[PDB]
Swiss-Prot record, chains A, B:
Belongs to the peptidase S51 family. CDD domains: GAT1_Peptidase_E (cd03146). The keyword Protease applies. Its main location: cytoplasm. The keyword Hydrolase applies. Keywords: Cytoplasm, Dipeptidase, Hydrolase, Protease, Serine protease. GO terms for molecular function: dipeptidase activity; serine-type peptidase activity. Hydrolyzes dipeptides containing N-terminal aspartate residues. The active site is at S125 (charge relay system), D140 (charge relay system), H162 (charge relay system). SUPFAM superfamilies: Class I glutamine amidotransferase-like. Pfam families: Peptidase_S51. This is Alpha-aspartyl dipeptidase.
Length: 240, 240
């Protein structure tokens, strides 16, 4: 089971407006990884310029006291995952990210490292999407075609990051985020969808899940009214 | 070739705020279908309640002087397409729509009816997406998984419907529509992306294409600055 093995920090978004990269969650990253993790394995696949992405993430994690290895600089990404002390998958285009995880044979390897070996996993945004059962509730454009929407399944429910309340000033006739999720929940056997607004994130420790941050999360359950939850809320019931 | 065979009316959105279903484009529908088309074959697959969707579309098209058959009430959808005088694919969830076109074996049948038999095609929003080479530039959530993102290819370029200018009042850190398309244009061999704002639509007659409506279209070319185009603009250069 998961009880003493699963460690996830699932961030909705990397940056608050006017703030620094990972600044709003930097204390939680520090607590989550702890003092005994020396190096973090970064996965930059969600963005096109992997070199510049790794440089940005390395600057921040080195400022936090961690070395940073990018899997795109490893000659054997599978081996890099098998040796990682901690894994951070950054945001970007979720379809591009998931296809690249499949293309580099990393789905099973990351699953084993996190769920069986207890290696801590950080996701930001698209990296949070691929931590879930599937990317059915990403906001991103399908710029490439992954072989499946199934992802790492580190948790069995879906997440909608960057969750956005409807705009009352708006005459735009496109779907609201809630309307899009409602349509998902018309399809067969779909699981709960956790809408993490920007500024909030989910800490998973075994079979415990906790909302952290400074904003509310909107939970979408199939056939039910959406419910709103304050930082500190216990989401353990979403875990098996 | 296409010169005297292809007839498309590609609408960005069905309804102006405060207006009626297809009201803003109803005159163009009338000119496009003409007086000799008696019945329109409707494809409601983009929405979950196909019965209610067909009822809504039937009310409008009957008010415009056309009978309406919904392919979801046909016992052989392929045969219904082969006999259609005109085809209208309505908006909804583009992934759900495309998967259902594939599931009902309608991609080839619709392609033949439109491109070889000269049958007029109307798309609205998601129905405009599936008229293009692929649905890579839909705004919709991947609530189901079609076998491919390739669509009808009635035109060889991509369309982004409901195109939305960035919000200057907004502190939301999610991608702007332009940022999403730019990422598409980082992938290999991608074609032009026509951003149809709400209120504008594309009329295709053979190898001629014209912007119609009351709003501007933003054209995205790979590696180039986006360009803005007024109603009446000649987009024929996007066609082969
Ligand atoms: N593209 C987003 C993910 C999403 O909104 O689904 C990000 O990684 O920032
Ligand atoms: N879901 C939209 C299509 C899109 O925005 O891509 C519609 O059919 O209205
Ligand atoms: Ca991010
Ligand atoms: Ca529509």
């Amino acid at each position: 089971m998961m009880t003493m093995r699963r460690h996830l920090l699932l961030v909705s978004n990397s940056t608050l407006h006017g703030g620094g990269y990972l600044e709003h969650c930097q204390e939680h990253i520090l607590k989550f990884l702890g003092a005994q993790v020396k190096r973090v394995l970064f996965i930059p696949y969600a963005l096109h310029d992997r070199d510049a992405y790794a440089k940005t993430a390395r600057q921040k994690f080195e400022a936090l006291g961690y070395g940073l290895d990018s899997v795109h600089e490893s000659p054997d990404p599978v081996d890099a995952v098998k040796k990682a002390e901690a894994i951070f998958i950054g945001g970007g285009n979720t379809f591009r990210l998931l296809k690249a995880l499949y293309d580099n044979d990393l789905i099973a390897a990351i699953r084993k490292r996190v769920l069986e070996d207890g290696v801590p996993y950080i996701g930001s945004s698209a990296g949070t999407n691929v931590a879930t059962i599937s990317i059915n509730t990403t906001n991103d454009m399908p710029i490439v075609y992954p072989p499946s929407l199934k992802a790492l399944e580190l948790v069995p429910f879906n997440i909608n990051p960057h969750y956005l309340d409807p705009d009352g000033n708006s005459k735009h006739m496109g779907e609201t985020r809630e309307q899009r999720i409602t349509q998902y929940h018309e399809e067969h056997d779909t699981p709960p969808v956790l809408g993490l607004r920007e500024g909030c994130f989910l800490l998973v420790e075994g079979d415990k899940a906790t909302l952290l941050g400074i904003t509310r999360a909107r939970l979408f359950l199939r056939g039910k009214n959406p419910t709103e939850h304050e930082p500190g809320h216990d989401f353990s019931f979403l875990l098996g």
